Amino acid sequence: CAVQVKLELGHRAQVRKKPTVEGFTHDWMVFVRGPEHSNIQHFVEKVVFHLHESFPRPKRVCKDPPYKVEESGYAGFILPIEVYFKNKEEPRKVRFDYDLFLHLEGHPPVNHLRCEKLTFNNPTEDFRRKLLKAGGDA
Numbered sequence: 847c848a849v850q851v852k853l854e855l856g857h858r859a860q861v862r863k864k865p866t867v868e869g870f871t872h873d874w875m876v877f878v879r880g881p882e883h884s885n886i887q888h889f890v891e892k893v894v895f896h897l898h899e900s901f902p903r904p905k906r907v908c909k910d911p912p913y914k915v916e917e918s919g920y921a922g923f924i925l926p927i928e929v930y931f932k933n934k935e936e937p938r939k940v941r942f943d944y945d946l947f948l949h950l951e952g953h954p955p956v957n958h959l960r961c962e963k964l965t966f967n968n969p970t971e972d973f974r975r976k977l978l979k980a981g982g983d984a
């Protein structure tokens with residue numbers, strides 16, 4: 847009775863040609879998306895990105911796609927990402943601790959993807975429908 851859906855977490859990080867006035871050396875972007883041909887918005891209520899507390903307003907909420915944060919800075923960190931589901935039964939959300947690493951000047955930019963498969967056992971009829979609308983496999 848299980849439905850499987852796929853998330854792709856990822857980030858890009860590039861050394862700026864010129865640091866910001868604050869001395870920020872890199873531009874980076876972190877995201878959650880589905881695979882090609884999917885629509886995770888049917889089952890995802892929101893994605894919450896928890897930045898390092900050196901960032902202002904570090905709890906970044908995306909209620910609609912694209913589920914992403916674009917920032918600048920000078921060091922990588924572990925970035926908790928919560929994906930909240932439009933589900934009334936457990937699990938209500940999932941947390942991923944994402945390795946937002948940066949590379950040195952003179953090295954290629956970073957462009958990584960982390961693929962997660964979610965397996966919903968015995969979803970409710972309403973959540974089963976949402977998972978299938980998103981592209982999930984029964």
Ligand SMILES: CN(C)C(=O)c1ccc(-c2cc(C(=O)N[C@@H]3CCc4ccccc43)no2)cc1O
Nearest residue numbers: 868870898900901902917918919920921922923
């Ligand atoms: C308008 N403006 C400049 C901003 O909104 C802004 C301010 C601060 C920052 C920012 C970025 C960083 C940053 O890269 N911090 C890292 C991230 C990990 C870490 C660990 C220890 C010390 C610093 C850091 N700190 O502050 C980013 C911004 O976009």
